[PDB]
Design a protein around this nucleic acid. Structure first.
Ligand SMILES: [Cl-]
Ligand SMILES: [Cl-]
Ligand SMILES: [Cl-]
Ligand SMILES: [Cl-]
Ligand SMILES: [Mn+2]
Ligand SMILES: [Mn+2]
Ligand SMILES: [Mn+2]
Ligand SMILES: [Mn+2]
Ligand SMILES: [Mn+2]
Ligand SMILES: [Mn+2]
Ligand SMILES: [Mn+2]
Ligand SMILES: [Mn+2]
Ligand SMILES: [Mn+2]
Ligand SMILES: [Mn+2]
Ligand SMILES: [Mn+2]
Lengths: 78, 105, 97, 93, 95, 108, 84, 99
DNA sequence: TCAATATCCACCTGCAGATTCTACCAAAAGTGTATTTGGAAACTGCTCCATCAAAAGGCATGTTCAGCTGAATTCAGCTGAACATGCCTTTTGATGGAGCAGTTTCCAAATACACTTTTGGTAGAATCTGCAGGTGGATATTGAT
DNA sequence: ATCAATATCCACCTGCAGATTCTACCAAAAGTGTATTTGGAAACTGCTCCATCAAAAGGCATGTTCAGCTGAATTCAGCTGAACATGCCTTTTGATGGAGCAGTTTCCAAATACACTTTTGGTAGAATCTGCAGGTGGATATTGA
């Protein structure tokens, strides 16, 4: 399912990053990182969720989580 | 009669800032000018970003400030960039920039 | 019958993407992925479309930021190709590893 | 219900620098995050300051010192100005 | 005169004898231990606080301190911390 | 009245439930503080200082020392993934660094 | 008090090499010394500035070790051992 | 015919040595002057708790030591073994200190 | 340099989705009074910071020398970019319906208060030892041959 | 391989610089009795959020060619480590004078309470508008010959 994050997109991401030449192994490497990122943040959000005794993760739950990871995001409530 | 904001010569809700400073458990008691001062500073920085952002828009022959414009406004100013270095602006994109060693010939 | 040399289109894509801002991962897949991990933490959850968007923005930002530090590491090694070594190196200095 | 924000004020301050310019809502979102953030930073720092100094109250004095520790060299100057000014006025009226 | 100043030294020490009866803690080492206790208290207290605020709740119950603890601590460290927290609490309330 | 028992003893803890409870109030965190908030917070702090003194005191034994010092606290922390990640941005005065040398640096 | 100047040379080549060693550095370039002094310069400045601000705000003429601790934590370099 | 350690052997000896110790590595006095010089260039007539000058050295050495590790990681990545300014600046840039 | 294939850049043009705009209500944000209290003055007890003196040797500074790096080249095997294809997974819109954040009150349990007694801690004494700093003697490493 | 030259490692001492264990107040827990306040809580209700279609492109998955990028291998000037001589200056030890933290007591400007009294800011619809996005048409930028 993470495989869903296609080579082409990982390619685009790198491009905006200023990368000109990608190594074949860069793909499976990126997915791993991407997963660890989504796992650490999603886990945090859901904890905030579960705390508010809700069954719905709200954008604030992400924002708050993201702020705990030192990944402050602007545009969804703070 | 007159709102503390209009009195402080401010466009920001002094009264509101004050309520919050009180609400968000920061101190036990809140001075009477802290809500003013803080609201002054907040307004300043806001005007500071808006002008640089609006200037970013005019340079794009656009008259409405979008996130791109706020990202280009910030990342292009040492001060604002340092103050917001660990903040990510959704829909902001990135400053165009390509490392030399990557150019042709 | 024309053909552009290796790297040229690549630079073009660099110029095109640093200029735009649309998200670079197909929405569906991503959302499916988010929900998949979420299930592993608490079951039968719901997601504000905006919370999913929040995550994809954050996540794409992260990845791009990391691709930059990575590229700089590849250049340090006198290369122009980013490879696992580089993401690794960068992430370690970043202190995520 | 009600869900207050800085929107009006942002937009107010906007017309004072670019009466001619408008603003996407998405942009207005980013502008709030911003004010909330900085508001939180300064407030939090001011909160500590009082504590380090065992004071029961956060005064504009903390809010200033808090702004110096928090804002980049040049930005801080002006901010301290605007703040000191905005108080001096308010208080003499 | 020379107003007294609180510390966590006493308890760090008690706990020390509990695990290593024969071992003793130097001074600088105890100096660290306090920083740690304080430091981690601050982290938990804050998230606990922040958490309550997010949920328009004026009180920080043990339930706050718990979520706080799961966000702050990692892996087993958190699991054991909670086991111990919960335990120590019901025992308290349970008369 | 009745004989004074401490909340700590009621809780079966060594750390000061009373003191922790006060620090919570006087600390400007929330407006009101539950009864089991200080009991739970102490318990966690008591568990953690015990998890690191166990590890620290061993580092001390492994070095023929009977008195734990900062070095020992460092090796205790920097060797336990869990604790190291936890204190991954804290620096221990007088603690040194862990003995580690990149391979490519040794003679061949 | 005599005038203080060029004290950044107090950080001798011997010393910086020593530091690199604890940092597990085998071979040191010749320019590393001046670069290091540069980095240290900024590190100190940044940490003293903040500490000295915590002092001024306390109406004090003495920089207490706590100022430095609060200064360091603000800088994201939490120190243990003086905090109490 | 005097004995002579091949270059690089004393280094390793020094590494193995300093990682085992925890003593500060910069001389106290030289470093106290640097603190006092820098400080007084921000505000005059300042005074320092002995404890405070120490808090700072522990902090700097701690920082420089740890910086050198990343810096060594960089040199190595360059198929080198000698740290050079390039390395320190790449570390600090990625470190996010000053990109 | 000449020639050809694609890119890019402009100036328009025209809906379509957002945005300013045009009205109205509870929740705040001022007011007027009364009460309460934090932390600024003033003063003074006393810690401890800045200094100065002196002696001793641990180290920083400079210099000689040459091992073995880092920086250059050269070279070609093959990893990864540019492409033309082929087709299926994602994007886009409406429903339709169920789950569920969000309120809305009740109110039994849980906190905050006021302050009165009770002790657990903290600040110096009095009492103790782990081990720093030395010394030798194995053991283990390096580096020449 | 084998010494010969050093450096490292371990155990054996033992006074004393710090860590323990005592002792003795008193700051602040713990007890009680007495007002708030909190936030679960059984019902209810309009959003939001999944599901389900259901087509249409895009956009991604493939298999080709070959350009040129990354290593591997070989070189070698000279940078940087090791070893030494020389003697500077940081350390160590102490003793002193005061600059200044800190501990106590006064209380007055200032912040908090309360009770109301007005004004706003947020919430829905109501009238435009700014670009996005598509369309030539004209130089650009590449790249091959
Ligand atoms: Cl004030
Ligand atoms: Cl790799
Ligand atoms: Cl509780
Ligand atoms: Cl360099
Ligand atoms: Mn044990
Ligand atoms: Mn008082
Ligand atoms: Mn000399
Ligand atoms: Mn040579
Ligand atoms: Mn080489
Ligand atoms: Mn070829
Ligand atoms: Mn007792
Ligand atoms: Mn020894
Ligand atoms: Mn005086
Ligand atoms: Mn209005
Ligand atoms: Mn357009």
């Amino acid at each position: 399912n993470i495989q869903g994050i296609t080579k082409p997109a990982i390619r685009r991401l790198a491009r905006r990053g200023g990368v000109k030449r990608i190594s074949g192994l860069i793909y499976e490497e990126t997915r791993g990182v991407l997963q660890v990122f989504l796992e650490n943040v999603i886990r945090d959000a859901v904890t905030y969720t579960e705390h508010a005794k809700r069954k719905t993760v709200t954008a604030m739950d992400v924002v708050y989580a993201l702020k705990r990871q030192g990944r402050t995001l602007y545009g969804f409530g703070g | 009669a007159k709102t503390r904001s209009s009195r402080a010569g401010l466009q920001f809700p002094v009264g509101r800032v004050h309520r919050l400073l009180r609400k968000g458990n920061y101190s036990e008691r809140v001075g009477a000018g802290a809500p003013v001062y803080l609201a002054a500073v907040l307004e300043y920085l806001t005007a500071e970003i808006l002008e640089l952002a609006g200037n970013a828009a005019r340079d794009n022959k656009k008259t409405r400030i979008i996130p791109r414009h706020l990202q280009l406004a910030i990342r292009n100013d040492e001060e604002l960039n340092k103050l917001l270095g660990r903040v990510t602006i959704a829909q902001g994109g990135v400053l165009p920039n390509i490392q030399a060693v990557l150019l042709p010939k | 019958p024309h053909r552009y040399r290796p790297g040229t289109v690549a630079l073009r894509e660099i110029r095109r993407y640093q200029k735009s801002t649309e998200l670079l991962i197909r929405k569906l897949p991503f959302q499916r992925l988010v929900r998949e991990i979420a299930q592993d933490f608490k079951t039968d959850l719901r997601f504000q479309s905006s919370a999913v968007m929040a995550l994809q923005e954050a996540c794409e930002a992260y990845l791009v930021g990391l691709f930059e530090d990575t590229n700089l590491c590849a250049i340090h090694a006198k290369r122009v190709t980013i490879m696992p070594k580089d993401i690794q190196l960068a992430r370690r200095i970043r202190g995520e590893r | 219900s009600r869900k207050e924000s800085y929107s009006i004020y942002v937009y107010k301050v906007l017309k004072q620098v670019h009466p001619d310019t408008g603003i996407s809502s998405k942009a207005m979102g980013i502008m709030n995050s911003f004010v909330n953030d900085i508001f939180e930073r300064i407030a939090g720092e001011a909160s500590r300051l009082a504590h380090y100094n065992k004071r029961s109250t956060i005064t504009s004095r903390e809010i200033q010192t808090a702004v110096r520790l928090l804002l980049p060299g040049e930005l801080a100057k002006h901010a301290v100005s605007e703040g000191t000014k905005a108080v001096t006025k308010y208080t003499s009226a």
